[PDB]
Amino acid sequence: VHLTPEEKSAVTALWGKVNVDEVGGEALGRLLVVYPWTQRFFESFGDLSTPDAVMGNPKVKAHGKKVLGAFSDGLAHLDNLKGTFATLSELHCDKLHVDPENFRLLGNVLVCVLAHHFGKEFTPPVQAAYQKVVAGVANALAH
Amino acid sequence: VHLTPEEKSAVTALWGKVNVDEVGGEALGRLLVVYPWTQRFFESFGDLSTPDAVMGNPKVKAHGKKVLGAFSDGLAHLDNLKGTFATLSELHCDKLHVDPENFRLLGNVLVCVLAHHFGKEFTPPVQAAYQKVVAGVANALAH
Amino acid sequence: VLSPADKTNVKAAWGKVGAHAGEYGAEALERMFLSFPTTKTYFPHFDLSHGSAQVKGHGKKVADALTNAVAHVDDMPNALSALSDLHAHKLRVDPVNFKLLSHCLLVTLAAHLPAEFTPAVHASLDKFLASVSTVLTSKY
Amino acid sequence: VLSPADKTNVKAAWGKVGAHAGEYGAEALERMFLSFPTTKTYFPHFDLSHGSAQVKGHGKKVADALTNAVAHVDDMPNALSALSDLHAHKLRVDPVNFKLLSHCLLVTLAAHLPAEFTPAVHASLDKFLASVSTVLTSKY
Ligand code: HEM
Ligand code: HEM
Ligand code: HEM
């Protein structure tokens, strides 16, 4: 992903204050709530009927922690996203059969979560930089 | 795009019988008719109101001939597709501002045109091989 | 939001399809399975080989669903309510797969009705299948 | 198709937005222009810089249309017919741009209403914006 030095500095600075446990679980739960067809993949997690049940699922929170850890790993290697997300791409394509559009949906949900968490600190330039990082992670995973 | 020898032979054999002038204009006109928002890029071609006027447009026919020539050039280089469509990708992304979904829409319209022109000879295996080639051309252009 | 002219076009095209609708539905499903293998994950108990009786029966069911949708084009949302609940609430099908099946149906129609597949009929059938995919995707 | 629960959620969220609708719409337009370059091409006669009065007025118009849609959720196709004709017939806007504008509106709402943006309200607003987009992308 090509980013300006200011864009990369802003992305790193915003990711500095991201709480790893809270941000990932909330993004995954909001994905499962807003796009209900995504629960097909996570049926093994457990009760996902109501939004309050989705947001209060320890398995969902733990998987969100894992997903956001992968996002952080991709952030630390922004110049080699395709090589960073190769094993995960194979896992999601060959074994899970997740459609590539769902990666873009999850990235957009994560951007909304970041905006909800940071408020006015999530300026439009920061949103643009994070949109590009999210698209790069999604294109790397869809490979 | 990775193809089996059987798929590559079938694709080449079916493309050897394609009439370049008719197939390209048909695909472009059907794109303009089915997806009318694509006429924003061709508003300089003249009259595009009626479908009968769209399919009877010499400028549309010539542009479809050029597009199918590019498709054939990509077909001859199925291992070098990103390199062949670098100049076209730059042209479509920087000066024309074409969304990548339109490339896949045009590829599907071309597949429908091939099925219409070849009838029973367009077997499901041939369709699958051509779908993969069309997806690779769209991905190469979207870069 | 279909026009009267496109409604007439769709009705005429499906009437020309006629009794071959079940075979066309089975061929469309076979094309979808062959060109988009991720769609096969919705049929883990099915035999998806060529000429399969299970795929033939499912294609017949899909074809009769499309036929009654054409016969009730004005009232699709309640003509396909049971199907919409099964597709969205029970099966949980991605709308991308609905787009793929609509494309494969269009390819089958093009291959089997060369004369009928004018650009106007193509656009009418494309938007009719888009409307059908809309009703099945919507969840209530 | 919306339900009474998410309809109430949408009405409450937009009422909490209140008099800041024009500011929110201008901010959403700026976010869309910055995040996506292709959307700007539709405004070649505009001044698309930060703090632009033209973008501010356009955001005011967009927010007024959204407020009308919120007040007229049950008759959206008949309430947004002029906008549908403008965007589809005359401007010829790609539906992907409608999706991007909906996303940027959601981001602005999340950034400005932390407490109001629960997951249920997020889903309700996503469905409402999707309904508006499909109304505006329909060709009569
Ligand atoms: C940018 C987007 C995504 C990233 C970075 C990501 C990352 C990950 C990671 C790190 C794992 C853990 C793998 C392991 O522990 O071995 C995983 C597994 C998984 N992912 Fe994703 N993921 C993304 C999108 C999605 C989406 C959108 C879905 C479904 C709609 C999905 C479905 C799954 C499933 C079902 C698993 C396995 C969980 C289990 O078996 O319990 N992923 N992904
Ligand atoms: C998907 C595969 C496509 C291929 C292989 C392709 C190929 C080409 C080629 C070879 C040219 C060169 C014409 C020239 O240099 O004068 C061209 C130009 C152009 N393309 Fe495409 N194209 C594709 C998709 C699209 C789509 C989907 C659109 C619009 C929705 C589009 C819009 C245009 C326009 C507006 C021009 C310039 C026409 C002119 O200046 O007269 N292209 N394309
Ligand atoms: C696009 C138009 C579609 C139509 C008209 C349609 C119609 C039908 C019909 C009539 C049935 C039989 C239900 C019953 O007899 O109770 C059915 C079942 C089913 N459909 Fe669809 N369908 C469509 C799209 C799809 C797509 C795109 C998929 C998957 C990619 C899908 C997956 C299924 C599955 C898994 C079943 C259950 C069959 C079984 O478990 O034996 N459908 N559909």
Ligand code: HEM
């Ligand atoms: C929920 C989505 C949208 C709403 C509620 C909306 C609403 C409006 C309104 C109220 C106007 C004023 C009409 C006029 O001043 O003549 C307008 C005009 C316009 N819209 Fe939208 N719009 C939406 C989406 C979009 C998108 C996504 C784009 C482009 C990416 C777009 C492009 C335009 C353009 C170019 C104009 C003409 C502005 C002018 O002539 O000064 N619209 N829209």
